Design a protein around this ligand. Structure first.
Ligand SMILES: *Cc1c(COP(=O)(O)O)cnc(C)c1O
Ligand SMILES: *Cc1c(COP(=O)(O)O)cnc(C)c1O
Lengths: 349, 349
């Protein structure tokens, strides 16, 4: 009775022919954990969609099966993207399994090799550019439009969004309905878009009656969807949402406007508080960007934007294991305590 | 169609009273991945039981779900661990979800902080001691048996093994039979013991005609079971199997004896080869101990000990994301390249 490809599990809902060979690491089918302790504390009933348990440790895997399978079927020789993030690790894994070249474009200056390690493990070719992060985007786009054998797998890839919409399907599949509000973090806004595409596809299929309110959280230092303008120098420890200029700007706002949803900023402190909260109280280890979403849900419950007793799924987008640096910092100082059994046992209970 | 807790999926084959409420993070039910390219080069059909997609990033969640449920039920207010490894993270998370204290005893001097971040992220109390790794094992054992509310969660805990056998169940549930050989890494030998318990349990219950030959790999520098005697100063990049003295030395040898199995050493180099190989060829980012399992499987297929065209399940025990440091080592640094899209396209092909 095991989980198959997200492609296989939802084929009749995805744009794939009968001919193609789905290349999958059995992504999706991820836990939906009852946040019993967050629920008691709020008064709302909160589930966690835990996407860190996808093959590469983030939800990008839902897009890549789809992007890479479509690439294979369409006879592409290379899969390209231009960021140091979870996109590249996810892209590189699926390209490796397909047997396809994977290139990651990066800007000049200092390289965070910690970021790229997982992807280079999978065979990604890293290519550093005489220029900045814009040049990377401009380059990757020009190549994709010049070489129909390259497939740019960035946020705005229609196939990626199709794959990613399935997280919405699973939530309903197990609950029997949508939540009252779905809360997720927003960087490029590809995900909020996908969930909204997903929920509306089920409503259109007559599988729910109520649609959720999409709550998207941005870090205060990179909150262009909150402030209504692009951000010149995005600034947040939640690296995955360190975006001053979302790729899927239009689609995010449409989702917000159509779902009667909200965009909301959380400060780094508040993100960090959530970061610790989930781990300390739910037993779930979540990446800072994933924490931001909880940080925002919580912020919204105070405000009263989300009503007491309503049902909420909070997408927690990546494994805490993605980011050891942040785990290391703000740790309690342990100093040697004497070796007798009685002293140590009182330092507890 | 959601996967519940190991406890819930296999409640009838696990020792849990029916007053006891399972403390679970929806662990287990992990992908069984067809290793297509590994098979091409091998001449066998090989599956990878990918255990890095458990909540805390390791197979130990299978055991820890039981131990902490058992702990919660028997009115225990603290669990105690004496290891910095994956045990303590797995222990700490289930302790958090259950709302009990998790405490880790560390030796004098230099604190291995990276290794403990996950644990303390789930709220483990690190207690540094005026002693040795050996004096640490003793203080815990003493504290355990002088306070009936403190449970020691080490590897030899029979409750852990019960939870850990359930992997064998999943393999048979999904394959329809047991494989011809089951390959896995061996540290304290709890897992190899546990798988063999699982296969026999399913033999005793009538679900398989024949039991798999258990193949267990250790690192060449930490190979007490291959070498026949214990090892004083174990040495290997594979931290998780850096054990000179298995806690389950007895029941491991029994598993090998009665499964007609084999213990094998693999060099550090060979383990690295495999680590890179699964990532580059399957798309599975696997932690070095997990790599060893594979490496030793590969070594045995060439040795001839593994019959041509037989079936193998290789447990890949932990997530590559558990070991960022190894991911860094021996990684190509590419240098800056001219911006024009022509200078990039044939640096691919
Ligand atoms: C990519 C990513 C995000 C941001 O998602 P968008 O679709 O760009 O809004 C958030 N969290 C994690 C872990 C990420 O991988
Ligand atoms: C603990 C562990 C092992 C070794 O398991 P044993 O039962 O001690 O042999 C191997 N790999 C990983 C990832 C582990 O955490």
């Amino acid at each position: 009775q095991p989980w198959p490809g997200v492609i296989a599990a939802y084929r009749d809902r995805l744009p794939v022919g009968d001919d193609w060979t789905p290349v999958t690491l059995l992504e999706g089918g991820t836990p939906l954990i009852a946040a019993t302790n967050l629920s008691k504390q709020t008064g709302c009933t909160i589930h966690l969609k835990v996407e860190g348990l996808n093959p590469t440790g983030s939800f990008k895997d839902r897009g890549m099966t789809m992007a890479v399978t479509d690439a294979l079927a369409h006879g592409q020789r290379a899969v390209l993207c231009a960021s140091t993030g979870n996109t590249s690790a996810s892209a590189a894994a699926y390209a490796a399994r397909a047997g396809i070249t994977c290139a990651v474009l990066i800007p000049q200056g200092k390289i965070a090799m910690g970021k790229l390690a997982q992807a280079v493990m999978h065979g990604a070719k890293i290519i550093q550019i005489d220029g900045n992060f814009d040049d990377c985007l401009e380059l990757a786009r020009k190549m994709a439009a010049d070489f129909p054998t390259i497939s740019l797998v960035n946020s705005v890839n229609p196939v990626r969004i199709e794959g990613q919409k399935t997280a919405a399907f699973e939530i309903v599949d197990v609950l029997g309905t949508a939540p009252d509000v779905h809360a997720l973090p927003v960087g490029n806004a590809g995900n909020i878009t996908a969930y909204w595409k997903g929920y509306t596809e089920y409503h259109q299929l007559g599988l729910i009656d109520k649609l959720p309110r999409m709550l998207g959280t941005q870090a205060a230092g990179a909150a262009p969807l909150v402030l209504g303008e692009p951000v010149s120098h995005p600034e947040t420890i939640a690296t995955a949402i360190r975006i001053g200029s979302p790729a899927s700007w239009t689609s995010a706002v449409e989702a917000q406007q159509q779902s009667k949803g909200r965009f909301l900023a959380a400060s780094d402190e508040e993100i960090l508080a959530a970061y610790h909260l989930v781990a300390r109280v739910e037993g779930v280890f979540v990446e800072p960007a994933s924490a931001a979403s909880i940080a925002g849900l919580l912020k919204a419950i105070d405000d009263g934007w989300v009503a007491r007793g309503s049902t909420v799924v909070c997408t927690v987008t990546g494994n805490g294991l993605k980011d050891p640096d942040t785990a290391l910092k703000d740790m309690p100082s342990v100093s040697p305590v004497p070796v007798d059994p009685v002293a140590v046992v009182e330092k507890l209970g």
